[PDB]
């Protein structure tokens with residue numbers, strides 16, 4: 424059982 | 437029924453980042469950014485589950501870049517300090533000479549920066565104290581716990597001293613037997 | 614230090630109903646305390662919450678690969694992490710310790726306050742009731758409410774304002790999902 428991290432997304436520049 | 441939240445933040449100019457999992461308002465774990473380690477809120481949790489802390493560090497890197505982007509969009513509108521509400525309590529009924537824990541609950545504040553000090557008879561105490569990371573709220577402020585195990589006696593009084601940029605004077609919350 | 618602060622927050626939320634039957638995922642981004650863009654699994658794409666988040670909504674919605682990654686999050690992320698920690702989170706049951714002791718409403722009067730201390734239970738849902746000689750006392754009841762200790766335990770004080778007469782028996786009755794029948798503690802004057 425390994426927790427999964429929901430990835431952040433790079434904002435628009 | 438249940439809500440699980442993966443909460444993250446990054447704060448300038450302090451360059452402080454945080455990453456944690458929340459279950460129904462309780463912390464499951466957080467990632468120490470310095471040690472790059474998963475820190476389980478209860479030791480039992482680390483025997484049934486795992487988490488690779490590298491995934492947290494990558495998210496913090498994106499949040500850092502996003503904050504610079506959002507700061508430009510807002511035309512560098514800074515955050516407004518919200519001072520905290522502080523409560524001092526024991527986790528069990530107090531008996532003389534029966535070991536107990538003092539709990540300092542710091543609530544409803546932002547930004548997540550605070551200087552907390554335990555005082556016994558007006559002097560700082562460091563032996564045996566512990567604390568949590570900044571915990572998220574649904575109104576997107578923060579809360580925090582500090583703990584001090586102690587032997588109750590009529591000879592001692594205690595204070596939790598909390599300083600926050602939203603406070604003019606340091607906030608002292610008292611407790612005595 | 615009076616330098617201005619700038620804060621970025623992200624919250625990835627998984628809401629579960631009836632176990633993992635109904636699940637909803639929210640990808641939420643915050644500037645200071647203001648949510649500006651979010652992904653709701655009920656909608657299937659990002660929506661700007663304020664004007665500050667419109668560039669992110671348009672940009673992120675143009676990436677079909679990112680969107681389907683978010684649309685599968687209820688399976689690959691929410692339901693997965695639910696099963697990872699279900700044994701020590703969903704099914705965690707700790708029964709409370711119940712103490713009863715008197716107190717004073719005025720520091721020089723007599724004991725006119727019965728405190729029912731209910732400590733160390735999980736989860737938070739709990740019902741505390743006061744009785745006098747087998748009759749439920751619903752008047753004069755004050756409580757701290759539910760207090761979170763921050764260590765996966767709760768506590769609460771339920772106080773009954775009363776003038777104890779000799780021979781009276783008071784019982785504090787506690788109901789909690791970790792119990793199969795009410796937990797009662799008596800106090801005699």
Ligand SMILES: *[C@@H]1O[C@H](CO)[C@@H](O)[C@H](O)[C@H]1NC(C)=O
Pocket residue numbers: 509510511665
């Ligand atoms: C920032 O300033 C620009 C230029 O006046 C304006 O178009 C924009 O709406 C402003 N944004 C905020 C969040 O104040």
Ligand SMILES: *[C@@H]1O[C@H](CO)[C@@H](O)[C@H](O)[C@H]1NC(C)=O
Pocket residue numbers: 549550551599600601614
């Ligand atoms: C905490 O104390 C340090 C000095 O020890 C100071 O630089 C900092 O601004 C303080 N932070 C707060 C939130 O009061």
